[PDB]
Design an enzyme around this catalytic site. Structure first.
Site, short mmCIF file in Angstrom:
data_model
loop_
_atom_site.label_atom_id
_atom_site.label_comp_id
_atom_site.label_asym_id
_atom_site.label_seq_id
_atom_site.Cartn_x
_atom_site.Cartn_y
_atom_site.Cartn_z
N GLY A 5 -9.08 1.39 -1.56
CA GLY A 5 -10.03 0.35 -1.92
C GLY A 5 -10.85 -0.06 -0.71
O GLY A 5 -11.54 0.76 -0.10
N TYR B 184 -9.85 -1.16 2.31
CA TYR B 184 -9.04 -1.13 3.42
C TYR B 184 -8.96 0.31 3.79
O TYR B 184 -8.74 1.31 3.16
CB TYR B 184 -7.59 -1.61 3.28
CG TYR B 184 -7.41 -2.89 2.58
CD1 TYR B 184 -7.40 -4.12 3.26
CD2 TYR B 184 -7.21 -2.85 1.20
CE1 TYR B 184 -7.20 -5.33 2.58
CE2 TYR B 184 -6.99 -4.05 0.49
CZ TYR B 184 -6.99 -5.27 1.21
OH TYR B 184 -6.80 -6.47 0.55
N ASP C 204 0.83 -1.20 0.00
CA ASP C 204 0.00 0.00 0.00
C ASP C 204 0.87 1.25 0.00
O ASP C 204 0.61 2.20 -0.75
CB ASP C 204 -0.95 -0.05 1.18
CG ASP C 204 -2.11 -0.97 0.93
OD1 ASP C 204 -2.73 -0.87 -0.16
OD2 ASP C 204 -2.37 -1.84 1.79
N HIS D 106 -4.29 -12.31 9.64
CA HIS D 106 -5.73 -12.12 9.72
C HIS D 106 -6.44 -13.35 9.17
O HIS D 106 -6.44 -13.58 7.95
CB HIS D 106 -6.12 -10.84 8.99
CG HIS D 106 -7.56 -10.45 9.15
ND1 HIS D 106 -8.11 -9.37 8.48
CD2 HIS D 106 -8.56 -10.97 9.91
CE1 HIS D 106 -9.39 -9.26 8.81
NE2 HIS D 106 -9.68 -10.21 9.68
N1 LIG Z 1 -4.90 -1.94 -1.13
C1 LIG Z 1 -4.80 -1.72 -2.57
C2 LIG Z 1 -5.58 -2.78 -3.34
C3 LIG Z 1 -6.94 -2.27 -3.84
C4 LIG Z 1 -7.02 -1.08 -4.57
C5 LIG Z 1 -8.25 -0.62 -5.03
C6 LIG Z 1 -9.41 -1.34 -4.79
C7 LIG Z 1 -9.33 -2.53 -4.05
C8 LIG Z 1 -8.10 -3.00 -3.58
CU LIG Z 2 -7.09 -8.15 7.21
#
Ligand SMILES: [NH3+]CCc1ccccc1
Ligand SMILES: [Cu+2]
Ligand SMILES: [NH3+]CCc1ccccc1
Ligand SMILES: [Cu+2]
Ligand code: NA
Ligand code: NA
EC number: 1.4.3.21
Lengths: 620, 620
Positions: B372, B374, B290, B584
């Site tokens: 996204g 998270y 990330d 997790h």
């Molecule tokens: N954490 C980044 C991965 C992600 C990015 C955009 C939508 C869903 C998942």
């Molecule tokens: Cu998690």
């Protein structure tokens, strides 16, 4: 109306009357423990019988007694003479604290050692320490305390700054006999003071701290009924108090929709042990079971609003017995309040446009106790999301010695000439479990690493395994932080909507357990402390992991004797015993009064609910 | 005036002007990262040169550039064409999020797979996921994103409740080419909704929560000067913000009497990785950095008073660059406040009669980011007693899949037909250490158990050992919870009044590190995550444990390449890198929106002060 209500002064007065009448409370008698018994399994006979357990000491040297009394029926139920050479001595009495210093004050050997150090006997405080069981055959069956000396320069001086090393005495507090005085050599008494209220040490106080005001303009969100029954944010429980264990939590349950779902039947800190790691003969015997030997509840502080407890506080004032059976109130001994706990759940969704934030809070139930130099706070936390947490807060003044010239492998230097021996603070939590009822089982959950190969071509897979503990002989478990080891308590007869057994996961801090050599006296007396997790089958008389009479017991009682029965614990009424503790290498910053350090554990729901249980929390 | 001040909109506008003029910012260019550089070692030349680092992407397919710019001297310092097949791709651009769904929407293979599932393409959201490096030779040197599909039943629907399993596509976002569509089979799209604001799911909201009011009637105890310099309760520091790392702490120091004593020169979360443990070909490639791939700072939320931050809040509103070099304010992106933290120190002394209680407090610096599904909160805590703590709070919606009929060893069931693959959230804290100055060293401290015998006759002794890490090749360390392992950062040239080196002790949570097979792609790209502790010699260009260009880098860059230099770290300018994380295994209670879980670490003074540093705190 509740059988779990706190003992009242009236109930205490009746017990004293009953004992007196029966001839059990003569002027040579002392009550060393008094406590209400929990209702037996099958309280659905609502025939309340308020029963009390009493340990009676005899200052004239006669045999003590264990006595059960029914306040409901004004009768003595049983009374048992105790052979203390066999089953252990009674807990230290408060009135015995002074007796050690007074007896030594007229002993010629003691006065001799003090005069060689040019110490005025009137300045010398003597700490009354539990004796343990070691090599002294003359101590078996006798009530022995050991004494270590500290100098007070003036009545408000902190004596801990001035240990008198190289000197220890053993005292028989019944026959009033100083049995040994050991003088292994002279050490300079450290000179600096440790008076943390002296402006010459504190310097000018800060003026930069501005107030934080915490208020509840509409009052708190929890209600208390019947003296000690709490209802808060779907949680329900009873707060008990015992002079040995302190705060005890009963009938912890969660209102999930219409159902009241049990989680824990009884939660307590059932024992705590402080072993010292200094091999010097002056201190190598030093271990105290604050709970089992001294009774932490009877030293609970009265907690001050704004200093000890901040915010909208509800107090409980528990009632205990003094040594003669009179009731004494511990005014404001238990603090109860809710606290904001940050963000509970948050998400801003790119695709839906919904922005969602909720705040967490926790219910705090706490008390503080003081035994000699040690001070301990016991905190239970209940959170909105179903988590239960315990936290111990350790503070006070560290136990001191001389710092030996040329250093030490087992003692920290805190100030010129002043040392602090290495030690541990180890707790035993007893969790009488009731996950959706009494049919429970424990699984050990380990992370499983997987090898790259067929079925795992990219080498990214990992898994977990669970092992059911089916009998007591296999239910003595060790931590393994490296494999993420946790334990799950589940009810195999209660399933969530995905048809999986409901459960709670125990998360430990994975601190070191008892460090002493397994052949030592302390490893035998504190066997519970050598393993992280024990599971037993519930039984009325299996209350403490060290047994009922810890003081000068030779070892083996408690958990190692219980689990030898090898009972079935696979879907049964079970009790989880969790060992956790702090290993304390004292630092300069711990002197002259120690900032709080903490240790604990928590339990989180593991498929207990059918979805997050906090969907119905509102926006702030 | 401070060289550590936050970047201003004016500085951003100058950078855009400079780049434009030099021909580096054509309409095919996109800024993928812009950030201020820290002053070099030896800023005692007070010749402030505000310099910025810029990554420039080219949407037409030309080679990107790394560019350093001096706002002070209005000049381009260096500009480097990048071979991304060699040194890795640039971070994901925000505008590329939509591009994956739009390109797939006209692809016949994609439409074919959707029609077989009777899904309306207009309802299908596609998550833009980083691609990693695996077996597809055609991806080397190309800018690739992978797409996983979720169904939105209506515009406010939570798409995470409706994963489309058995289907994945790879997309080249520069040439606008769907390179592969893989359909391994049809799975039912889980039907239940996960709309946590729907009254039909939440039920009636609670009415039992009464307000907690936290106020500071005289304002807060900390002062902010120069935009971002904090002074609070003897602490001093600068709060920086970087679009990649987020909140960065500079120049952490403590005023001990007259001296300002440095502790940490720079503290940041320098990388974070989320690896998934599902071996299914649909997801076995899934890992996102990330921080390094997406840049967590640019997704920082605006934090609402009373919901996200409660009490007397001071906000910082940091300025970053958009893809074209315009400045954008993150309004209220950093919350700053002090919190009450219970009892700091307490003792009631039997012998002196003194009753002493002091309360603790902490300074909180926090932000939240959303990428996204998270959501993550980053919290730095400074306490009265010298402790520094970091806490990560993980929430949001779990990443979902189908729950396969007959179960899974690598996926949890959250609802009928709905699964959540096992994964980790692993953080890298980079602590550029400065304990009383820059001459520092790291010792590993283990508890030492001692055997019963000569010198330890009662078998109660225990000790500790410290091992100095002298070179980088021996400074890659693993946790050992069983032996109480910690690490001490000390300054061997600065001694306390007991003539011992001053130090700080790092206490880790001892959670599992990277679980993937050591031969996997992720173990190579996220090598930092396989060990708990790394120590390097400071160097200007060694900023991230994964290297500068994480996206689609083939592995090895960062920490394993740095420590190969085997430099001297025994009393030198060193950097501590601590890996810590959460493993997790999703639970039912994590659905449909997840209660916060936490992980972190703390540093406590270890003989840094000459006595407790909180003796001058006043009574409440
Ligand atoms: N954490 C980044 C991965 C992600 C990015 C955009 C939508 C869903 C998942
Ligand atoms: Cu998690
Ligand atoms: N913790 C119990 C040991 C103790 C008791 C009284 C004074 C000092 C020490
Ligand atoms: Cu201690
Ligand atoms: Na039980
Ligand atoms: Na450094």
């Amino acid at each position: 109306a509740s059988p779990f209500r706190l003992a009242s002064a009236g109930e205490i007065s009746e017990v004293q009357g009953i004992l007196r009448t029966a001839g059990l409370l003569g002027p040579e008698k002392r009550i060393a423990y008094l406590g209400v018994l929990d209702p037996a399994r099958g309280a659905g006979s609502e025939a309340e019988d308020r029963r009390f357990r009493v340990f009676i000491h005899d200052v004239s040297g006669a045999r003590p007694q264990e006595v059960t009394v029914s306040v409901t029926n004004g009768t003595v139920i049983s009374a048992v003479e105790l052979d203390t050479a066999a089953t252990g001595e009674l807990p230290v009495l408060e009135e015995e604290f002074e007796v050690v210093e007074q007896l030594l004050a007229t002993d010629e050997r003691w006065l001799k050692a003090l005069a060689a150090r040019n110490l005025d006997v009137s300045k010398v405080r003597v700490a009354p320490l539990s004796a343990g069981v070691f090599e002294y055959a003359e101590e078996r069956g006798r009530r022995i305390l050991r004494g270590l000396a500290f100098v007070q320069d003036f009545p408000e001086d902190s004596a801990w700054a001035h240990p008198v090393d190289g000197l220890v005495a053993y005292v028989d507090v019944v026959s009033k006999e100083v049995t040994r005085v050991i003088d292994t050599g002279v050490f300079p008494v450290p000179a600096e003071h440790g008076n943390y209220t002296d402006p010459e040490l504190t310097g000018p106080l800060r003026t930069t701290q501005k107030p934080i005001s915490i208020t509840q303009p509409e009052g708190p969100s929890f209600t208390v009924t019947g003296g000690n029954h709490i209802e808060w944010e779907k949680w329900s429980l009873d707060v008990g108090f015992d002079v040995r264990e302190g705060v005890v939590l009963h009938n912890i349950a969660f209102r999930d929709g219409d159902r009241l779902r049990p989680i824990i039947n009884r939660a307590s800190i059932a024992e705590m042990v402080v072993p010292y790691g200094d091999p010097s003969p002056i201190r190598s015997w030093q271990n105290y079971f604050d709970t089992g030997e001294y009774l932490v509840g009877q030293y609970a502080n009265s907690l001050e609003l704004g200093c000890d407890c901040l915010g909208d506080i509800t107090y409980l004032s528990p009632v205990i017995s003094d040594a003669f059976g009179n009731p004494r109130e511990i005014r404001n001994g238990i603090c109860m309040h809710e606290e904001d706990w940050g963000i509970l759940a948050k998400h801003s969704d790119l695709w839906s446009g919904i922005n969602y934030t909720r705040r967490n809070r926790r219910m705090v139930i706490s008390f503080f106790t003081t035994i000699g130099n040690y001070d301990y706070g016991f905190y239970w936390y209940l959170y909105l999301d179903g988590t239960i947490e315990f936290e111990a807060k350790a503070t006070g003044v560290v136990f001191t010695s001389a710092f030996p010239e040329g250093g030490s492998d087992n003692i920290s230097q805190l100030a010129p000439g002043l040392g602090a021996p290495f030690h541990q603070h180890i707790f035993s939590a007893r969790l009488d479990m009731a996950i959706d009822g009494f049919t429970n089982r424990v699984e050990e959950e380990d992370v499983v690493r997987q090898t790259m190969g067929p079925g795992n071509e990219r080498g990214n897979a990992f898994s977990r395994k669970r092992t059911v503990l089916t009998r007591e002989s296999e239910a003595v478990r060790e931590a393994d932080a490296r494999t993420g080891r946790t334990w799950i308590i589940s009810n195999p007869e209660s399933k969530n909507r995905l048809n999986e057994p409901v459960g709670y996961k125990l998360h430990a801090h994975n601190q070191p357990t008892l460090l002493a050599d397994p052949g030592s006296s302390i490893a035998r007396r504190a066997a519970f402390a050598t393993k992280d997790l024990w599971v037993t089958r519930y039984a009325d008389d299996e209350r403490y992991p060290t047994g009922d009479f810890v003081n000068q017991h030779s070892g083996g009682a408690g958990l190692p004797s219980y689990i030898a029965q090898d009972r079935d614990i696979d879907g049964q009424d079970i009790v989880v015993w969790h060992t956790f503790g702090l290993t304390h290498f004292p630092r300069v910053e711990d002197w002259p009064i120690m900032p709080v350090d903490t240790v604990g554990f928590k339990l989180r729901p593991e498929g207990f609910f059918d979805r997050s249980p906090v969907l119905d929390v509102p926006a702030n």
